[PDB]
Amino acid sequence: MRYRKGARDTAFLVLYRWDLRGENPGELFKEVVEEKNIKNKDAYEYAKKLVDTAVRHIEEIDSIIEKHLKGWSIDRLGYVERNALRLGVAELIFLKSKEPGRVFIDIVDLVKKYADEKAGKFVNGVLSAIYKAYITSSKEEKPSLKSE
Numbered sequence: 001m002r003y004r005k006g007a008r009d010t011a012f013l014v015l016y017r018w019d020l021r022g023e024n025p026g027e028l029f030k031e032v033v034e035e036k037n038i039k040n041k042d043a044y045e046y047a048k049k050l051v052d053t054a055v056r057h058i059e060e061i062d063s064i065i066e067k068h069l070k071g072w073s074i075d076r077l078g079y080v081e082r083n084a085l086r087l088g089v090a091e092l093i094f095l096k097s098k099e100p101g102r103v104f105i106d107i108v109d110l111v112k113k114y115a116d117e118k119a120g121k122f123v124n125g126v127l128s129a130i131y132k133a134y135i136t137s138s139k140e141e142k143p144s145l146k147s148e
Helices: 003-020 025-035 041-055 058-066 079-094 100-114 117-137
Strands: none
Touching: 003 025, 003 041, 003 079, 003 100, 025 041, 041 058, 041 079, 058 079, 058 117, 079 100, 079 117, 100 117
């Protein structure tokens, strides 16, 4: 059984908890595992690390999303999406990458099950928005000072 598949899906819920509690996602995760018969501890632990990929710079991630929001707000409307968005980008570069287009879809497909399917359309599209912004946010490496 692809236990890892579940560990990844649960990632969003952790981020979702931040919207309500906004505290150490590590402790919060412990609360849900209790209700959700995750069982496969491997998955629960693996899941934790997965969400951390998002937390490696959560705030910056929002910023990363904002640069492409063309001014809009990641909060848009749907709540899940807002949190889910961070989890999707977590992969982008934070986790290196690896089939980014498909990576979001699965994650986004997960949203269809939880959050409205219509939101999934926006979730995937907006996810790619960060990708384009990344290539631009790459780096320019300015000169030490030259002044020569």
